[PDB]
Amino acid sequence: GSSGSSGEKPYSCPVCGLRFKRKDRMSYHVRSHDGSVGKSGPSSG
Ligand SMILES: [Zn+2]
């Protein structure tokens, strides 16, 4: 797949196929696909 733009829409959801205008909104959607999490355990103290 080739977009074809020197530089437009720096924030998009190519994972599923859905462009976005907001950077904070796309981060909540695009993330919905690539799920990852596993903070460290409770350290002493
Ligand atoms: Zn998406």
UniProtKB/Swiss-Prot annotation:
Zinc finger (C2H2-type): 11-33
Transmembrane segments: none
S-S bonds: none
Localisation: Nucleus
Tissue-wise expression: Ubiquitous.
Record-stated family: Belongs to the krueppel C2H2-type zinc-finger protein family.
Known role: Transcriptional regulator that plays a role in many biological processes such as embryogenesis, senescence, T-cell development or neurogenesis. Interacts with the TP53 protein to control genes that are important in proliferation and in the DNA-damage response. Mechanistically, the interaction inhibits the DNA binding and transcriptional activity of TP53/p53. Part of the transcriptional network modulating regulatory T-cell development and controls the generation of the regulatory T-cell pool under homeostatic conditions. (Microbial infection) Plays a positive role in viral cDNA synthesis.
Disease: A chromosomal aberration involving PATZ1 is associated with small round cell sarcoma. Translocation t(1;22)(p36.1;q12) with EWSR1.
Complex formation: Homodimer. Interacts with RNF4. Interacts (via C-terminus) with TP53; this interaction inhibits TP53 ability to activate transcription.
Name under which the protein is recorded: POZ-, AT hook-, and zinc finger-containing protein 1
Organism for this UniProt entry: Homo sapiens
Residues of the full protein shown: 380 to 411 of 687
